[PDB]
Amino acid sequence: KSRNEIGDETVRKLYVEIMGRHSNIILTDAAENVIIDGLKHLSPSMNSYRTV
Amino acid sequence: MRVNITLACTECGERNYISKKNKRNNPDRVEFKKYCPRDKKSTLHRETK
Amino acid sequence: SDIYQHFRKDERAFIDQALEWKRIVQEQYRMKLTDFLDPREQVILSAVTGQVGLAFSGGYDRAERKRAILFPEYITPEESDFELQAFNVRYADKFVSVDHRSLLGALMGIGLKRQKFGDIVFSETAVQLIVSADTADFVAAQLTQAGKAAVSLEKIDLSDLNIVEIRDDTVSSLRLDAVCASMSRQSRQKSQTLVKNGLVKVNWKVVEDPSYIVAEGDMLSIRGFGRCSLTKIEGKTKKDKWRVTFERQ
RNA sequence: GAUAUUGAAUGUUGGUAAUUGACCUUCUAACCCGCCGCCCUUAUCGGGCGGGGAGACAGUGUCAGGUGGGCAGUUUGACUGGGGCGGUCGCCUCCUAAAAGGUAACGGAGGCGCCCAAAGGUUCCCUCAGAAUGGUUGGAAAUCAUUCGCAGAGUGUAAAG
RNA sequence: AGGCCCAGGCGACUGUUUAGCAAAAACACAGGUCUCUGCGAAGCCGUAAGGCGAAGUAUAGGGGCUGACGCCUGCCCGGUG
RNA sequence: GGGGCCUUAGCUCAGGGGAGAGCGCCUGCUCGCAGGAGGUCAGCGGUUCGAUCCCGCUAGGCUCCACCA
RNA sequence: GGGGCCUUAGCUCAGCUGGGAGAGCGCCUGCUGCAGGAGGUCAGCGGUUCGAUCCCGCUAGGCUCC
Numbered sequence: 001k002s003r004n005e006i007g008d009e010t011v012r013k014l015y016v017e018i019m020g021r022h023s024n025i026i027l028t029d030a031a032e033n034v035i036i037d038g039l040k041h042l043s044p045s046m047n048s049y050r051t052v
Numbered sequence: 053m054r055v056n057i058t059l060a061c062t063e064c065g066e067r068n069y070i071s072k073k074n075k076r077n078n079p080d081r082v083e084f085k086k087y088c089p090r091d092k093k094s095t096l097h098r099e100t101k
Numbered sequence: 102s103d104i105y106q107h108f109r110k111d112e113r114a115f116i117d118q119a120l121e122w123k124r125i126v127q128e129q130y131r132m133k134l135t136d137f138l139d140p141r142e143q144v145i146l147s148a149v150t151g152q153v154g155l156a157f158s159g160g161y162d163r164a165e166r167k168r169a170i171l172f173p174e175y176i177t178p179e180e181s182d183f184e185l186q187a188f189n190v191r192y193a194d195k196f197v198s199v200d201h202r203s204l205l206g207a208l209m210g211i212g213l214k215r216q217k218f219g220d221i222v223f224s225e226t227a228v229q230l231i232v233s234a235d236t237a238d239f240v241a242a243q244l245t246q247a248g249k250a251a252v253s254l255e256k257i258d259l260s261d262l263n264i265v266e267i268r269d270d271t272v273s274s275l276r277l278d279a280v281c282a283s284m285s286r287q288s289r290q291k292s293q294t295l296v297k298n299g300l301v302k303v304n305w306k307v308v309e310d311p312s313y314i315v316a317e318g319d320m321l322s323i324r325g326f327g328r329c330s331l332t333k334i335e336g337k338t339k340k341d342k343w344r345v346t347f348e349r350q
Numbered sequence: 351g352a353u354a355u356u357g358a359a360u361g362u363u364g365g366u367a368a369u370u371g372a373c374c375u376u377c378u379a380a381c382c383c384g385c386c387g388c389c390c391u392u393a394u395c396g397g398g399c400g401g402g403g404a405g406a407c408a409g410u411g412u413c414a415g416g417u418g419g420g421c422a423g424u425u426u427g428a429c430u431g432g433g434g435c436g437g438u439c440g441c442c443u444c445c446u447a448a449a450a451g452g453u454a455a456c457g458g459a460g461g462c463g464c465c466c467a468a469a470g471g472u473u474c475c476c477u478c479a480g481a482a483u484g485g486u487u488g489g490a491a492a493u494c495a496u497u498c499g500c501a502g503a504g505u506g507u508a509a510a511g
Numbered sequence: 512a513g514g515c516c517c518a519g520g521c522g523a524c525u526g527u528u529u530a531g532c533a534a535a536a537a538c539a540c541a542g543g544u545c546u547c548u549g550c551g552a553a554g555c556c557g558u559a560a561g562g563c564g565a566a567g568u569a570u571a572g573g574g575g576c577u578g579a580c581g582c583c584u585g586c587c588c589g590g591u592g
Numbered sequence: 593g594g595g596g597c598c599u600u601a602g603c604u605c606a607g608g609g610g611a612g613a614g615c616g617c618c619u620g621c622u623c624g625c626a627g628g629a630g631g632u633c634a635g636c637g638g639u640u641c642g643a644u645c646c647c648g649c650u651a652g653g654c655u656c657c658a659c660c661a
Numbered sequence: 662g663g664g665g666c667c668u669u670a671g672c673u674c675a676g677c678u679g680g681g682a683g684a685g686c687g688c689c690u691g692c693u694g695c696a697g698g699a700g701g702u703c704a705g706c707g708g709u710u711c712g713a714u715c716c717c718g719c720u721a722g723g724c725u726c727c
């Protein structure tokens with residue numbers, strides 16, 4: 001639970017994936033389920049199932 | 053800045069003398085004892101208001 | 102009907118009621134005292150009334166929330182026609198401190214509407230408040246606590262009222278977003294978010310336009326940085342930025 | 351917009367001593383009708399007469415302000431190694447300038463469009479730059495002191511004299 | 512008494528135009544849109560009278576831009592209108 | 593080529609009097625606090641009692657021109 | 662025509678201006694992303710010298726340049 005720039009309450013989800021080579025730390029919006037950013041980017045060319 | 057002025061014979065009222073002063077240096081009405089050729093003698097001539 | 106365009110859509114509410122006050126004073130020939138209209142609603146009323154003459158007094162000179170008298174070409178008003186009661190806030194000042202937030206919160210806590218009180222004056226020697234005379238006895242009876250301070254209210258006359266951060270700066274433009282950024286010491290992109298969302302006001306009008314041009318002597322009200330005033334615009338620099346002066350409250 | 355054509359009433363609000371203004375509404379009789387009927391008259395002109403509509407408005411005149419390339423008359427510099435573009439245009443000083451004076455080039459260098467009420471007048475008195483040597487702060491460089499010292503300074507400001 | 516074919520730019524098309532150096536990719540066009548216009552219409556010609564508009568009346572008439580058809584036509588109203 | 597404008601701390605900008613302010617970054621303190629970090633002021637040579645702020649040139653970057661046969 | 666520069670492993674280029682032929686990518690191997698593999702007369706040809714992409718001789722070819 002954090003605040004936005006206006007001061008309204010927002011919830012962020014931080015996913016920490018432990019998958020060896022494919023391990024990642026990914027921050028998302030909790031409401032929209034949209035990725036804000038990930039420590040490692042995964043393009044559609046690298047993974048057809050999921051993009052980071 | 054420096055401005056045109058008239059001095060005037062404080063006796064007869066004759067506007068006898070133009071000149072220049074700096075106003076910032078000299079902000080109050082300057083006076084000098086310069087000959088009035090109406091009166092035909094030295095008088096105090098003061099800057100015109 | 103063709104007045105609303107000049108104000109905001111939310112401000113329509115007040116304008117409708119402001120027209121209904123003018124309606125009375127013309128037709129019925131009697132002064133209409135109002136309920137401490139907000140600094141913005143002063144500006145709106147002044148427009149809506151027209152030139153019905155208008156008077157305004159919030160007790161002391163320099164009250165934000167002031168009550169307005171709408172009077173015709175006769176019956177020019179007095180200081181007591183505004184129906185103002187001042188109070189000294191008594192508390193154990195040696196032990197506890199009352200601040201503006203606590204006292205404001207307490208006034209609202211007893212159920213007093215913002216329109217029923219003017220300014221809360223803090224001096225070195227006294228904490229005072231001004232209310233409408235119709236609510237005076239209620240406020241005196243109910244306002245027994247402000248924050249952690251137990252308080253009581255002593256009635257006083259208006260005559261017994263015990264009535265900056267200069268910051269010379271440069272801005273590229275006199276746009277709202279530019280002036281806020283400068284005053285509040287922010288990136289402009291951040292200031293634009295403030296303006297667009299509706300956090301800045303200009304003379305207590307919520308301006309949501311980043312490009313609104315701000316004039317000399319405009320009270321800006323950045324929610325987050327408090328309140329600040331463009332007091333001077335002082336020509337332009339060598340590299341063509343407006344020489345300006347800010348004064349935060 | 352004012353004013354004339356332009357009148358009558360009722361309110362209301364000015365200003366003078368009851369008259370004259372201002373504005374609102376109403377009226378009809380001026381004015382208007384590219385409306386109807388009748389007649390001049392075989393006439394979609396015009397005019398007359400009677401309705402109706404509108405009405406002291408409009409229209410038109412005079413005066414005023416605004417807008418106005420719709421239209422009109424014009425202007426839009428010179429020098430210039432062609433013209434344009436760039437630069438320049440008056441004044442001062444130096445060099446070019448050929449040991450009087452004057453002397454050209456879009457030749458070489460800089461200044462000016464002031465300043466000073468003393469930085470003017472006069473009287474009296476005086477001598478500068480820098481260096482050496484010695485000095486608590488204090489240092490290459492503040493302030494002394496000593497010697498040396500045609501000026502190596504100064505002369506409001508460019509340069510020359 | 513047709514040469515024909517493949518491919519591309521431009522304009523949809525038939526039309527129109529610099530009589531006498533340019534026939535075109537230019538103009539027009541049907542379609543689109545914006546806008547003005549309640550009728551003594553607006554617009555236009557004329558000092559006016561008188562006219563066109565129209566013996567029409569907003570599904571009409573004038574003006575601006577666009578130019579068949581198909582899919583579409585985003586952002587900016589501070590400046591200027 | 594010519595003109596016109598620009599060059600300041602990490603970042604954004606103040607500013608002939610001896611180079612600042614915010615933010616970032618560091619100090620300890622938990623939406624404010626508390627002190628630091630950092631400058632050939634594009635460079636050059638000069639005007640002078642001192643130059644970031646004179647003045648003349650050199651960079652570089654943008655900007656506008658480079659036409660008429 | 663005149664000058665200018667390069668040719669290097671599967672592919673693309675490093676290598677100081679002799680000090681002892683490499684990287685990246687691809688490919689082959691095992692592991693669970695990793696290391697490890699291969700692979701070049703350094704365009705070719707022949708001088709220099711203790712070693713030559715390296716120095717020069719000597720010809721390809723392609724670009725740079727009017």
Ligand SMILES: [K+]
Binds near residue numbers: 431
């Ligand atoms: K020539």
